[PDB]
Design a protein around this ligand. Structure first.
Ligand SMILES: [Zn+2]
Lengths: 129, 131, 129, 129, 132, 126
């Protein structure tokens, strides 16, 4: 109940575009990455000691084909969808600002490009292999 | 059971998003606090509309941190997860131009939100409820 | 050979080099469904009173449901151009400018298709609603 | 009302709905100067064996000053799509997707023109490099 | 001493996207802006007292329409060209990176949008004039 | 008020019309650390044999503690142009072309800054 776990082999996702002023993002060890990608992220509090993670939230992504492991996580599109929704809500508030508008546009165009990968794999017939 | 009562939860629907296996839900718009939804659920789509089959719960920071403390994730955290995974894909056999475009979009989204944050730092109002 | 200009207007764009060819559409008073639909690419060195057609391009006027398939869509023309520029990128003449142009054109299709997908949440696609 | 499809190839693009029309081009073995120049928009409701032409679009093939003006340019079609989208914006059909698309198509024209202006700075306009 | 000049009527151009680590940007006061924009910019050392400016560089922009007032300063396009040229040089070097590539693309598209404006104004015969 | 062009290179760019002004840098042979640092804006109506200086612009050349702060940064000039274009946007000359330009310049600043921030996470910048 210390709201606190051993950092273990979890890797801290540290990226120049993120300030880590309040939160830190961890994922699992690269050695445990399945299918070329990380799938088990933790958002913890940044002022936590480095040997531990103070967990705020866990986010797990679909890992393996739904065909044999079933539905077991979220998709990138789900998270992007939540952000667009929230930002759009702020646009409908006194916090409306141009930076949010650009961010919404970028996120929509992001969804468009990911969708294009999918639609192309349709026209090629190999969807979800 | 795997199902929970849908209740006031509203399904979030975008045409840009497919919906085959997953569904996204937020708390009811009348129940939003601080002008946005903060309590999302991804559930299984093949569920009756009366219910939600929750896969994942995501709760966002409610209220400025400097006034209410850390109690949820930020947009930036989720976007960083998606970036990290797309970059991982690019460093794989499935590197592709669409993923590169999507990374560029997500990074530029982070830069626009970060311009907002920097401006609010300069004005000293970052993490508050000032406008 | 030539035809009379008449009520046809010349479509000038400052972004368009307009060296050897000129573009025309029907008079703006003659537009149906709020847009021009009958375009003529003609030769530039021709009379003011004359258009020397090279090609006619006819867009779908009104809903197919009522007026039948009777013209092309914007998406079709843009598909043509994307195909050609992608062909150039398989050539000695691959250049970054063509790559940018392809990216812009694909993103244009994406925004038009977001409009379509939204109208297909409402089942009003191809209609005048 | 029909022509045989023959060697014409069907342009399938995932960003293109192909709900009511298909776009066809000439065989790749017949592409001249690295690119297709002879496109057909036909009705999607036809057997593969046949094409039901709605419209013919022919692109200038060969240098203009050696073969004369025999077809349209990419910029011509893009100009028409921009013109019609701006008409839509100046109508009840105005929407943000159209504004986005108009922006993208203008930036397309800007990049293609850059290619031109650069080649003129190098003094190499209209040559094989 | 010999370097320092009084800040006086100079405004400091603070932008959250600029780091201000080694330099600061100043311009003439908004009250003195001619033709709706600042034209007299000073890059100075940041590690100065706010009372003074330590000029590193003066940049003076074309002030008043050229047709009317003649050439007396640089244009936005000139400085953007300078920056593009340097960034392209960095791309053609051991220090090639994707961020510079994006910045070059953005600056080029900036030149293209300003140029669409200039094109459109040529066609109207109003380029270089004060006409709207 | 002219000067000899000398070894100075003229920056000839398809995106630049040279209608009123020409931009010049130093000879490629004199480039330090892979880039030009000493630019001149001169009047374009000048024979190739002279430069008609309107303005000199010198960029930070060499490491800062070895040679001092001896010039401007790319970010500074972009900040000037953004400030001017925003002023124009608050004027009778407001237009969509300016707004697009501003957006591009802000995104340019974001990308250059990202390189800086990435380097700082990895422990070296400046
Ligand atoms: Zn863009």
């Amino acid at each position: 109940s210390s709201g606190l776990v051993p950092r273990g082999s979890h890797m801290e996702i540290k990226n120049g575009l993120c300030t880590q002023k309040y939160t830190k993002v961890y994922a699992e060890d690269k050695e445990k990455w399945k299918f070329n990608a990380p799938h088990h992220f933790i958002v913890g509090k940044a002022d936590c000691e480095d040997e531990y993670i103070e967990p705020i939230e866990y986010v797990n992504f679909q890992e393996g084909p739904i065909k044999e492991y079933g539905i077991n996580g979220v998709n990138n599109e789900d998270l992007i969808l939540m952000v667009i929704t929230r930002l759009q809500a702020f646009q409908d508030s006194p916090y409306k600002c141009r930076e949010n508008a650009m961010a919404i546009t970028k996120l929509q165009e992001c969804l468009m490009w990911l969708g294009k990968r999918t639609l192309d794999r349709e026209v090629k017939g190999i969807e979800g292999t």
